[PDB]
Design an enzyme around this catalytic site. Structure first.
Site, PDB file in Angstrom:
ATOM      1  CE1 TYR A   4      -7.836  -0.094   6.284  1.00  0.00           C
ATOM      2  CE2 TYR A   4      -6.502  -0.137   4.279  1.00  0.00           C
ATOM      3  CZ  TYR A   4      -6.621   0.123   5.644  1.00  0.00           C
ATOM      4  OH  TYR A   4      -5.548   0.614   6.353  1.00  0.00           O
ATOM      5  CD  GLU A   6      -3.069   0.570  -0.009  1.00  0.00           C
ATOM      6  OE1 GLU A   6      -3.262  -0.624  -0.315  1.00  0.00           O
ATOM      7  OE2 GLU A   6      -3.719   1.480  -0.520  1.00  0.00           O
ATOM      8  CG  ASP A  58      -2.656   9.510   6.543  1.00  0.00           C
ATOM      9  OD1 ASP A  58      -2.390   8.335   6.869  1.00  0.00           O
ATOM     10  OD2 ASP A  58      -3.089   9.835   5.408  1.00  0.00           O
TER      11      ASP A  58
HETATM   12  O1  LIG Z   1      -0.532   1.530  10.586  1.00  0.00           O
HETATM   13  P1  LIG Z   1      -1.355   2.798  10.500  1.00  0.00           P
HETATM   14  O2  LIG Z   1      -1.949   3.242  11.824  1.00  0.00           O
HETATM   15  O3  LIG Z   1      -0.429   3.893  10.039  1.00  0.00           O
HETATM   16  O4  LIG Z   1      -2.664   2.496   9.530  1.00  0.00           O
HETATM   17  C1  LIG Z   1      -2.485   2.067   8.210  1.00  0.00           C
HETATM   18  C2  LIG Z   1      -2.705   3.266   7.310  1.00  0.00           C
HETATM   19  N1  LIG Z   1      -2.213   3.105   5.960  1.00  0.00           N
HETATM   20  S1  LIG Z   1      -3.344   2.959   4.690  1.00  0.00           S
HETATM   21  O5  LIG Z   1      -2.805   3.246   3.369  1.00  0.00           O
HETATM   22  O6  LIG Z   1      -3.827   1.573   4.648  1.00  0.00           O
HETATM   23  C3  LIG Z   1      -4.822   3.983   4.901  1.00  0.00           C
HETATM   24  C4  LIG Z   1      -6.033   3.356   4.787  1.00  0.00           C
HETATM   25  C5  LIG Z   1      -7.208   4.087   4.917  1.00  0.00           C
HETATM   26  C6  LIG Z   1      -7.137   5.447   5.160  1.00  0.00           C
HETATM   27  O7  LIG Z   1      -8.282   6.242   5.312  1.00  0.00           O
HETATM   28  C7  LIG Z   1      -9.580   5.703   5.327  1.00  0.00           C
HETATM   29  F1  LIG Z   1      -9.710   4.703   6.237  1.00  0.00           F
HETATM   30  F2  LIG Z   1     -10.411   6.742   5.668  1.00  0.00           F
HETATM   31  F3  LIG Z   1      -9.965   5.256   4.099  1.00  0.00           F
HETATM   32  C8  LIG Z   1      -5.902   6.076   5.262  1.00  0.00           C
HETATM   33  C9  LIG Z   1      -4.730   5.341   5.133  1.00  0.00           C
END
Ligand SMILES: O=P(O)(O)OCCNS(=O)(=O)c1ccc(OC(F)(F)F)cc1
Ligand SMILES: O=P(O)(O)OCCNS(=O)(=O)c1ccc(OC(F)(F)F)cc1
Ligand SMILES: C=C(/N=C/c1c(COP(=O)(O)O)cnc(C)c1O)C(=O)O
Ligand SMILES: C=C(/N=C/c1c(COP(=O)(O)O)cnc(C)c1O)C(=O)O
Ligand SMILES: [Cl-]
Ligand SMILES: [Cl-]
Ligand SMILES: [Cl-]
Ligand SMILES: [Cl-]
Ligand SMILES: [Cl-]
Ligand SMILES: [Cl-]
Ligand SMILES: [Cl-]
Ligand SMILES: [Cl-]
Ligand SMILES: [Cl-]
Ligand SMILES: [Cl-]
Ligand SMILES: [Cl-]
Ligand SMILES: [Cl-]
Ligand SMILES: [Cl-]
Ligand SMILES: [Cl-]
Ligand SMILES: [Cl-]
Ligand SMILES: [Cl-]
Ligand SMILES: [Cs+]
Ligand SMILES: [Cs+]
Ligand SMILES: [Cs+]
Ligand SMILES: [Cs+]
Ligand SMILES: [Cs+]
Lengths: 394, 266, 394, 266
Positions: free
Chosen positions: D175, D49, D60
């Site tokens: 997801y 990803e 984020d």
């Molecule tokens: O390990 P962490 O706490 O950093 O979490 C993983 C984040 N990486 S990601 O690309 O999957 C990711 C996935 C979903 C996100 O937003 C949403 F849920 F609103 F769609 C943002 C980033």
């Protein structure tokens, strides 16, 4: 001679140099004639409504009286244009100056609210205005200095004496005594020589008149007591006046207790001073044993004055109104309480009156009472002062 | 009050006016003050106008405000002024002595008691700066009961009713106000001949001009206009202020100025 | 799905993470139900009148329009409790949070007026409130920081990004996305995801409704144009809304021009930006060629935002409202002019709208026109900022 | 999208889940980024990803905000990310590559044009963080036209309508949101077994859990629960941040962490 009685019982009069008597008689005549002129009253009403924003709200506090049989309403003079009740009577006196043909304005100020009001009214009505302010008050009320300056007024810091309100008042009158053919002295409180105490009361009586109309509409009965802080006495006489013949209604005036009456550092001559002649009137004074006018003290610049208007001395003498004092610390706790539990930031002056109503509630919490506090102004000018205190404690 | 009458009846037999200086009592200290006043009289003062230090002299400009402050710094109180006055009277049995008071000092311990004390020490007149004729009743009555001349101000904006009250109520001398404003040598004084004539018409007490008199020319002008004299308070106190560290040259500079002023009145 | 249309033509929508959609649908349902609940409307009306002080004055300026055929009225939202129009809709959203059963409040603020309003409303109604403010705005609007603190609110300075409004907004939403079961996000302007643009407009429409009633009473006809500054768009849509079906009435929105549009340092995306998706909505954005959201700039913190509410983008697109810009220097001259010639100290935000009405007057002084300026707030929070500028010039 | 299907069909034939790391593209520079990603894959990443630096990553937390800022400091733009992606695909022909986008970067130069470019460089799926299923139409349609799997979030507050839309509209993988809030290793994730079952009932794409995965225990937990895998973005970027001046030890610390993470999925 005069058209109106210059005294309230033994208090009041016109103790000014002979040079100023024609100015006082002129103002008295202009006032008496204007009070009969429906065209002057319509213009006054127009400014109060469309410019200053009257009528002001009457706010019921629900949170601060919880667990008690006190119902507390606040007369919201803090919402008036300019941020305090001072604005009301300045519009009237500005119209009187124009009725007389005058073109300049002199004024004195401590909490700077009266100076701000005189400057805004002079800017609106086309008058050239100059304000005397004590250099101490320049400091503790500094948001208002530049407001004044922004509005085209000349601001004159007063380093004499205590460098507080009373020193501004002395320069104001000294100046008027050599400017009066062209300038009108716009005195900011219900004190000084006749006719000022009468004029200032009639130009503030809408405080009590509206409060009466609003409480009857909301509660169906008069209040048990109305409570106001007392500097020179304008907001309290404006609140009191329309209730004076309602003998069930208590009239409570709150003098600043400063650091404590017993310290001598206070602004409560009505209860703790002695009658004297100063600033053109016979009235309670703080003074030395041999007659020198003493320095007053309050945390609130707007109450830091060593006398009181003569009508309050008279209402006290016959028992019609009662006067009490509230210390700096009490006024500070009332300020905090209103901020956190009603979301209103009150002037430190008005906080003295709030603090006494809260004492009336707390001391006797099962007593049923309907109280109105004259919220004479907002506390934006006080937040820095209050910050520096609360931070030096925690 | 009988000292003023005695004076004016001898000033006029000598074809001159009166030169009346003003100072604050105890400015800059009790004992230098007395030698100022003795020096004013020996230099040629016909009478004295004497101020008692007050916390709020609202008819006074900065010169005399500073005189007041200097006396407070000296610890000078009203009770000490009245002991000073007694020594001045005991040195100067015929010189008329007038006080410039503010109302609160007169009212503080009793209006009658104040005038009783003036009589005890030999004061001849009292002018109360912040008391107009409209509020004068208890002041003028107490003054007359203790043989003190009540001094009334005739202002330049005087209408006719004022002239006739001042004329009837006043004793000693009538105070001819030069101008509006507060005391000061900075602001010099409209011609006052007309008011002088009306005052004489109504049997007023004789007229002295005050407020702004600073130069010999001003003094001769007033007697030229048929007035009886002139009062100068500041331009006299400024000589005092000028020489705070120079007491010897203070008095010489005063003596010089005074019958420089007095001569202008001959 | 939704109960109400989330778009104004192409602009608007709900561009938030999926996690927040139940929160938005809940708020939408609560709103739709409350707008039908006469008991919620009575409570709202009660707060607006007795607590905030509505209705506000409509002031006719006589001095500033002299020598011209312009009649200019000012809708006095500066007299509202708190010092600006922000207070109106915060009372409504606080009632909605309580209707939902929520107990905490989150809010963002730039000129600190919305933070002050959220803090006072939370103190009055018993909600725990936290406000995000850009560290630059902490500085240039510092009177409001301690007002907030005095009222029991937690104030969080934002050093990210430009350290201005938009950075506060980002922290607000980040926080809500992990607090929403208990906190209500009290968004301060008519922007963001649906339903906020709709709710904020309906909770501010009393601005235009009163103005309509007041001008008809005073002048017997509708205004030729109403003029308001446009940050996110709440005060302008509150002024505009009740006039939208009066097609003779011009609706003029004023974006900050900053140092000049041609400098790129401005806050005018409606006319000078490009449609993008950010802060939960599809709306004009200031952005780089490759889609990064750009930093905005205004002398007024309350206009220093790089987008605009979607209803303004739509009213512009169909020609119903016209949008213009006013630079810092123009807004400063309008501030001075109102202070000196009407004795009102206006917010630097509102001064942008004043400045455009004065331009309309000055450019065509023999044109007969009746204009209303939305005086969105008072300028006490701005006097230090303005001082430091005027002193660096003279 | 056919790379994801190929993967899951071989992961399951080997009785393991997938470990999918997240990093920002170009964090902390283009060329160190590529060696991070090559090191993640050689350490055992099943898929990637990959985030494109965005000015306002509102889903984020500070870890990935700082990743974004580091890439901006490196001058990394979207156009350079897409050249990076092409090099990653040309090195790694079977590794599924998903992008984490924000809506504005997808919409900026045309939604269809964005997905056309993803297909050109070999991207397999796109997740647009601030686009819910309610606003997903043009995104999902453009994705499908260019053979890109549109990734949908199944949140823990998912009602039934959401489950069935996500199931029907999604491709590649579903997801599984661990918790509310924003990305962060600080906040660790409610058990998600029930949503997993409903997703399988409706023929959803296979489920990966994300948001808060920081330790090997968390990873085995998710595959234990019948999910297909786990995503860890932060606790991976923090290894990057930790060693800004230590590029060599950056990669070794990453390699260590990754099939430490991957093994937990076997
Ligand atoms: O390990 P962490 O706490 O950093 O979490 C993983 C984040 N990486 S990601 O690309 O999957 C990711 C996935 C979903 C996100 O937003 C949403 F849920 F609103 F769609 C943002 C980033
Ligand atoms: O020479 P200047 O300018 O200092 O003026 C002389 C002042 N000395 S005084 O005692 O006669 C004097 C006389 C009258 C005063 O007030 C009043 F007019 F209101 F009554 C005050 C002082
Ligand atoms: C003395 C001043 N303030 C007076 C004041 C007072 C005391 O003045 P009065 O007693 O005349 O009302 C009370 N409340 C407020 C808000 C005030 O500003 C002044 O502004 O100069
Ligand atoms: C952004 C803020 N101020 C907004 C504002 C604005 C711009 O906000 P709207 O476009 O939503 O009215 C206009 N006038 C005043 C007095 C304002 O305070 C704030 O207080 O956070
Ligand atoms: Cl009478
Ligand atoms: Cl009497
Ligand atoms: Cl009347
Ligand atoms: Cl004059
Ligand atoms: Cl009635
Ligand atoms: Cl502060
Ligand atoms: Cl002699
Ligand atoms: Cl006589
Ligand atoms: Cl709909
Ligand atoms: Cl659409
Ligand atoms: Cl409704
Ligand atoms: Cl939550
Ligand atoms: Cl209607
Ligand atoms: Cl300032
Ligand atoms: Cl691998
Ligand atoms: Cl599917
Ligand atoms: Cs009102
Ligand atoms: Cs109660
Ligand atoms: Cs007082
Ligand atoms: Cs006009
Ligand atoms: Cs804007």
């Amino acid at each position: 001679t005069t058209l109106l009685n210059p005294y309230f019982g033994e208090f009041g009069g016109m103790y000014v140099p002979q040079i100023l008597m024609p100015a006082l008689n002129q103002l008295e005549e202009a006032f008496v004639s204007a009070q009969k002129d429906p065209e002057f009253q319509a213009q006054f009403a127009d400014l109060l409504k469309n410019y200053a924003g009257r009528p002001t709200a009457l706010t019921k506090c629900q949170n601060i009286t919880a667990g008690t049989r006190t119902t507390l309403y606040l007369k919201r003079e803090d919402l008036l244009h300019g941020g305090a009740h001072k604005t009301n009577q300045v519009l009237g006196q500005a119209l009187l100056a124009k009725r007389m043909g005058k073109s300049e304005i002199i004024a004195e100020t401590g909490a700077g609210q009266h100076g701000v009001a005189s400057a805004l009214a002079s800017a609106l009505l086309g008058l050239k205005c100059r304000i005397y302010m004590g250099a101490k008050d320049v400091e503790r009320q500094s948001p208002n200095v530049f407001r004044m300056r922004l509005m085209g007024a000349e601001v004159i810091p007063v380093h004499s004496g205590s460098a507080t309100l009373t020193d501004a008042c002395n320069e104001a009158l000294r100046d008027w005594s050599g400017s009066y053919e062209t300038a009108h002295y716009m005195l900011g409180t219900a004190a000084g020589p006749h006719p000022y105490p009468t004029i200032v009361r009639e130009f503030q009586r809408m405080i009590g008149e509206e409060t009466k109309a609003q409480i009857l509409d909301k509660e169906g009965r008069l209040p048990d007591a109305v409570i106001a802080c007392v500097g020179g006495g304008s907001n309290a006489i404006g609140m009191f006046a329309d209730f004076i013949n309602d003998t069930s209604v208590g009239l409570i005036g709150v003098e600043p207790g400063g650091h404590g009456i017993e310290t001598g550092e206070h602004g409560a001559p009505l209860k703790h001073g002695r009658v004297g002649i100063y600033f053109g009137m016979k009235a309670p004074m703080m003074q030395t044993a041999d007659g020198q006018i003493e320095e007053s003290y309050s945390i609130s610049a707007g109450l830091d004055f060593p006398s009181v208007g003569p009508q309050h001395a008279y209402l006290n003498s016959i028992g019609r109104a009662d006067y009490v004092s509230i210390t700096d610390d009490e006024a500070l706790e009332a300020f905090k309480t209103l901020c956190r539990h009603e979301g209103i930031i009150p002037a430190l002056e008005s906080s003295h009156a709030l603090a006494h109503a809260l004492k009336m509630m707390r001391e006797q919490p099962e007593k049923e009472q309907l109280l109105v506090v004259n919220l004479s102004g907002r506390g934006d000018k006080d937040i820095f002062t209050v910050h520096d205190i609360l931070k030096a404690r925690g | 009050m009988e000292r003023y009458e005695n004076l004016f009846a001898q000033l006029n037999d000598r074809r001159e006016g009166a030169f009346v200086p003003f100072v604050t009592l105890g400015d800059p200290g009790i004992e230098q003050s007395l030698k100022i006043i003795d020096t004013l009289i020996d230099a040629g003062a016909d009478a004295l106008e004497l101020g008692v230090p007050f916390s709020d002299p609202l008819a006074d400009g900065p010169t005399i405000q500073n005189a007041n402050l200097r006396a407070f710094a000296a610890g000078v109180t009203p009770a000490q002024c009245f002991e000073m006055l007694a020594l001045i009277r005991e040195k100067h049995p015929t010189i008329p002595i007038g006080l410039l008071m503010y109302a609160n000092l007169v009212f503080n311990n009793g209006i009658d008691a104040f005038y009783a004390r003036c009589e005890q020490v030999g004061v001849d007149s009292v002018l109360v700066a912040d008391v107009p004729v409209e509020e004068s009743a208890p002041f003028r009555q107490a003054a007359l009961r203790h043989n003190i001349a009540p001094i009334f101000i005739c202002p330049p904006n005087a209408d006719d009713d004022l002239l006739r009250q001042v004329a009837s109520y006043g004793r000693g001398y009538t105070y001819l106000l030069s101008r509006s404003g507060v005391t000061g040598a900075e602001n010099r004084g409209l011609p006052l001949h007309h008011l002088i004539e009306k005052l004489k018409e109504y049997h007023a007490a004789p007229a002295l001009q005050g407020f702004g008199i600073s130069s010999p020319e001003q003094v001769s002008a007033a007697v030229r206009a048929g007035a009886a004299g002139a009062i100068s308070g500041s331009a006299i106190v400024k000589i005092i202020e000028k020489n705070l560290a120079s007491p010897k040259q203070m008095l010489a500079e005063l003596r010089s100025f005074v019958s420089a002023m007095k001569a202008a009145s001959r």
